[PDB]
A paper describes a structure:
Acetyl-CoA carboxylases (ACCs) convert acetyl-CoA to malonyl-CoA, a key step in fatty acid biosynthesis and autotrophic carbon fixation pathways. Three functionally distinct components, biotin carboxylase (BC), biotin carboxyl carrier protein (BCCP), and carboxyltransferase (CT), are either separated or partially fused in different combinations, forming heteromeric ACCs. Here, we identify two BC isoforms (BC1 and BC2) from Chloroflexus aurantiacus, a filamentous anoxygenic phototroph that employs 3-hydroxypropionate (3-HP) bi-cycle rather than Calvin cycle for autotrophic carbon fixation. To investigate the structural basis of BC1 as a bi-functional enzyme, we determined the crystal structures of BC1 and BC2 at 3.2 Å and 3.0 Å resolutions, respectively.
Notably, C. aurantiacus BC1 but not BC2, as well as the BCs from S. coelicolor, Roseiflexus castenholzii, and M. tuberculosis possess a C-terminal biotin/lipoyl attachment domain. Crystal packing analyses revealed two BC1 homodimers, but only one BC2 homodimer in each asymmetric unit. The superposition of one BC1-BC monomer with that of BC2 gave a root mean square deviation (RMSD) value of 0.654 Å, indicating that BC1 and BC2 possessed the same BC architectures. Each BC1-BC and BC2 homodimer was stabilized by extensive hydrogen bonding interactions between conserved amino acid pairs in the N- and C-terminal sub-domains. Specifically, the dimer interface residues Tyr44, Val328, Ser393 in BC1-BC homodimer, and Arg310 in BC2 dimer are not conserved with other reported BCs. Using NaHCO3 and biotin as substrates, both BC1 and BC2 were enzymatically active in catalyzing the biotin carboxylation reactions. However, BC1 had a relatively higher substrate affinity and turnover number than BC2. For BC2 that lacks a fused BCCP domain, it showed relatively lower biotin carboxylase activity and a dimer formation in solution. By contrast, the expression level of BC2 gradually decreases during the transition from respiratory to phototrophic conditions, suggesting that BC2 likely functions in pathways other than the 3-HP cycle. Since BC2 lacks the fused BCCP domain, it is probable that the BC2 participated biotin carboxylase reaction requires the involvement of a separate BCCP subunit (NCBI protein ID: ABY36917.1).
Author numbering:
A (entry chain A): 2 to 132, 140 to 151, 206 to 229, 237 to 341, 354 to 431
B (entry chain B): 2 to 138, 197 to 231, 237 to 342, 354 to 433
């Protein structure tokens, strides 16, 4: 992979540019009339305006995105999260036009696009899923947290799991209800399922968790999630770089024994000019944002402004480091979701 | 500890305030008239002007600082690094006035304060010292050329327990790295053991850093010791998982180092760039994966010139040394410190210099 087209905006745009740069991958970014003043335009080597401020006109328009890759010499497109990431047509078009879609192959996206088909595809895999009048009584005499599992795979059949995250305004990894043994079990079933559908790259399978520890699959996201940085903190893995590498055609040199959860991490999403922006910092803080002082946020797309992810060796260490980092994050000129999140962290029930 | 007074200015002060806050400790900052505009003043719970812009007048005024603590309800004083961090008197003075110096005792400060006495004290403690003067002549040592500057972090408690938390290649101080490319895992255990015993011999409590020199054949020679926290400490905390400033405050509250040496491993590769000055109208720190930024900068901050040139500290980490150096390049091309010139361009050049990489 030599030059990538980033077809998203915001944080995820900056995050893909950061991954690319760390790997020697040049970058061209796709922006709308509304996202001209994005940090991504500055951070990226090159940039192309694909359309008008509305999304259908722009980010959800594949012909424009492919054209941008082509004018720019990009050999790959990173979908990001949202938009056309889980669109199987865009993937096919990227291939037809000889560009590498950094993601799952078109077919796994379609199977998991319909929740029902996916639940069945997974039942066939052996992944646990949710459990005449007379027949109905009989079925009834034999008959929840939200936890998500991270998976990653090669173009050669090796897949791994990178753990669980608990859920969206706050996400924490590890789950506070998950023992090491369940995680291992939840993950294997997941890796097996992704292998069943022939999955390539990163993805996340959502499950619902019982009082007794029984797990039932709900949906799979064939993309990267907003919730990825928390997994990384706990495991030491750059998932975004790995996607670029896998797309390059490289093998997953990682193994399951290699992946272990070492820290407790929590992520809070800060959502709605940012006249002043002082991120937090110091020990135990990661800020993934596209904000800067002097930024007039476009309201055409999201609420998201910043993502602070605090880690620690205990859950309370991390919760207390977020306390600090949310009282240090100075997003001025706009009202933010920081005040609410501060309440949640110190909610006794949380 | 209920409340601490931060007796320093700058990036450092925010570090101690940050640590204190994580541990539930109230913070009062002491500032010069020049340093009222600082972030530390905003971040801190309370603030006391201890005096005018000159240091002797303000930050080297132990009476002002002690009084400030007392008036503000502070029961501890973190001397920071620099200033009176290694002044034996301020430590004694703090005790007599019923305050807790967040640092070593007054005598390991005093012995190690004179380099000559330090070399000597450590020689008698079994640590190899540089071939040179036995005592004072000014001190003389031999000029060792083919040597590298490596340093060992030591942490210790009031009950006689001490651990080393690794090495730091302080060679290049504008750039610091951990692990050293010359120190093998065994040597880290050897060098650090010599450091742990030495500090046990001198009766040390709290954080300190013994500085050594390492020959081409791998042999170490003590040169100096800083009985304080260092500007170079974030790098180790990123390879070990231990907060050094938090532990300082804890040791002085009288708590036991619950860390055995088995529990400390250098599992990553970190590196740190000091961005120096050689109004910040626009400040934008780097971030993302693998970046930690310790700074006092803000968009609008008028950096004083008075005490240091330091503007920011960027620390990047990774499983490989080049992974570390490549996340740095990004971090440095992302840091926008506008309105003041900085050292960033020189840092980006060295990180990509052939020798450094090797």
């Amino acid at each position: 992979i030599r030059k990538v087209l980033v077809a998203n905006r915001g944080e995820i745009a900056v995050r893909i540019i950061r991954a690319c740069q760390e790997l020697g991958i040049r970058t061209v970014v796709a922006y709308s009339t509304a996202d001209r003043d994005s940090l991504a335009v500055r951070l990226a080597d090159e940039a192309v305006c694909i359309g008008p401020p509305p999304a259908a006109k722009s980010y959800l328009n594949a012909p424009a995105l492919i054209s941008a890759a082509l004018v720019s010499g990009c050999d790959a497109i990173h979908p990001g999260y949202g938009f056309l990431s889980e669109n199987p047509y865009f993937a096919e078009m990227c291939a037809d036009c000889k560009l590498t879609f950094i993601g799952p192959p078109p077919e796994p996206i379609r199977l998991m696009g319909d929740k029902a088909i996916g639940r069945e595809t997974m039942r066939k895999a052996g992944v646990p899923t949710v459990p005449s009048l007379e027949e109905a009584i009989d079925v009834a005499r034999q008959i929840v947290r939200h936890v998500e599992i991270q998976v990653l795979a090669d173009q050669y059949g090796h897949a791994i799991h990178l753990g669980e995250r608990d859920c969206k305004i706050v996400e924490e990894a590890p789950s506070p209800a998950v023992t090491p043994e369940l995680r291992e079990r939840m993950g294997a079933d997941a890796v097996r399922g992704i292998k069943s559908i022939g999955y390539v790259n990163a993805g996340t399978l959502e499950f619902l968790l019982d009082q007794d520890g029984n797990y039932y699959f709900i949906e799979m996201n064939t993309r990267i999630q907003v919730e990825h940085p928390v997994t990384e903190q706990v495991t030491g893995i750059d998932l975004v770089r790995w996607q670029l590498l896998i797309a390059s055609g490289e093998r997953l040199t990682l193994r399951q024994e290699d992946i272990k959860i070492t820290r407790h991490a929590i992520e809070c999403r800060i959502n709605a000019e940012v006249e002043f922006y002082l991120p937090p910092g110091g020990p135990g803080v990661r800020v993934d944002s596209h904000l800067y002082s002097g930024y007039t946020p476009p309201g055409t797309y999201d609420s998201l402004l910043a993502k602070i992810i605090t880690f620690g060796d205990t859950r309370d260490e991390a919760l207390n480091r977020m306390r600090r980092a949310l009282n240090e994050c100075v997003i001025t000129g706009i009202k933010t979701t920081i005040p609410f999140q501060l309440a949640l962290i110190d909610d006794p029930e949380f």
